[PDB]
């Protein structure tokens, strides 16, 4: 996996344009938000359990059939698996927020995720909904902490959804 700086530096040699003006501008823009990325990751790590618990409770509110008999969140075994996987998603999204690059998600979260979920019958719609709920809760916590320009926080979660959701149109 790579972070933003590593990918940009390697692309500098790959593309043959070296350290031109556009690369310098993108590097400066990225470095301007680095402290905010670290702060966002700190907030996510300090409130991980609360975020996951809130998101899973809201998911079971919006999908009451999940916890009913025959549902996928039926029994504490599957409930614990739900919580565990949502923690996985939150952890790797925090990693991607720090790195500024989505390669960590590609290599350690999304590679083979669809195969696993098809094998185990894990529904993807509720998975995307839970990721979006976690994203909303993280945004609420960041607004509470006083952060202002936190658009990049949307990038991992949304991206993950786009990678796991099926094609409808």
């Amino acid at each position: 996996m790579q972070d933003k700086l590593t990918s940009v530096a390697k692309n500098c040699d790959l593309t043959g344009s070296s350290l031109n003006r556009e690369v310098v501008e993108t590097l400066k823009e990225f470095l301007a938000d680095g402290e905010k990325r670290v702060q966002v990751a700190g907030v996510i790590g300090s409130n991980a359990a609360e975020i996951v618990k809130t998101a899973v409770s809201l998911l079971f509110q919006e999908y009451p059939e999940l916890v009913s008999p025959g549902g996928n969140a039926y029994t504490t075994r599957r409930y614990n698996m739900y919580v565990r996987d949502m923690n996985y998603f939150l952890r790797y999204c925090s990693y991607a927020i720090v790195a500024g690059d989505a390669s960590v998600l590609d290599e350690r979260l999304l590679a083979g995720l669809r195969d696993t979920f098809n094998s185990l019958g894990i529904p993807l719609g509720p998975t995307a909904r839970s990721i979006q709920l976690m994203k909303n809760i993280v945004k609420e916590k960041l607004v509470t902490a006083g952060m202002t320009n936190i658009t990049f926080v949307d990038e991992p979660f949304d991206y993950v959804v786009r990678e796991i959701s099926e094609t409808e149109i």
Binding site: G121, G125, E166
Partner: protein, 161 residues
């Protein structure tokens, strides 16, 4: 494809000899079971759409597969699953009439796994659907003919895994 008679003929032909008494006995068994096979084929033809409807209701409806984001979500994917089930039922009837699973291997199973993996179709769900279809057919037709058709339904299920 290849049916029971052709299977016995080829088994004798690779050795370059006439049908031995055991092959003749097997051929007589197939000839005697032909009447039951024809009756089962008639019954399945009459109620094919009903069989598929009952299969979908028994194994797929009101699950996370048909919920939004599921693989049977949207009308086109629902219709595609129904089309695949129709193919399975028709070719199971063909194989039951023929007395051999050769047509199933040739036409249905040779590449279905990789196709489903590429499309993202849940193979476990479709195996459960095929087993539910076997149950529906055995309830419609009977025990003996239901078991005879379930032989080929089980072959389809094994080939899907």
């Amino acid at each position: 494809m290849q049916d029971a008679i052709t299977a016995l003929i080829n088994s004798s032909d690779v050795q370059g000899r006439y049908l031995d008494p055991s092959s003749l006995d097997k051929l007589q068994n197939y000839f005697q079971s032909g009447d039951m096979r024809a009756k089962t084929a008639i019954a399945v033809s009459a109620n094919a759409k009903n069989i598929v409807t009952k299969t979908v209701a028994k194994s797929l409806l009101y699950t996370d597969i048909t919920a939004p984001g599921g693989n049977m979500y949207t009308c086109r994917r629902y219709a595609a699953c129904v089309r695949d089930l129709d193919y399975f039922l028709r070719y199971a009837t063909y194989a039951m009439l023929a007395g051999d699973t050769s047509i199933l291997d040739e036409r249905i199973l040779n590449g279905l796994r990789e196709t489903y993996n590429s499309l993202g179709v849940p193979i476990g769900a479709t195996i459960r659907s095929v087993q539910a279809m076997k149950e529906v057919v055995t309830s419609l037709v009977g025990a003996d003919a239901g078991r005879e058709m379930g032989v080929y339904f089980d072959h389809i299920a094994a080939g899907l895994s």
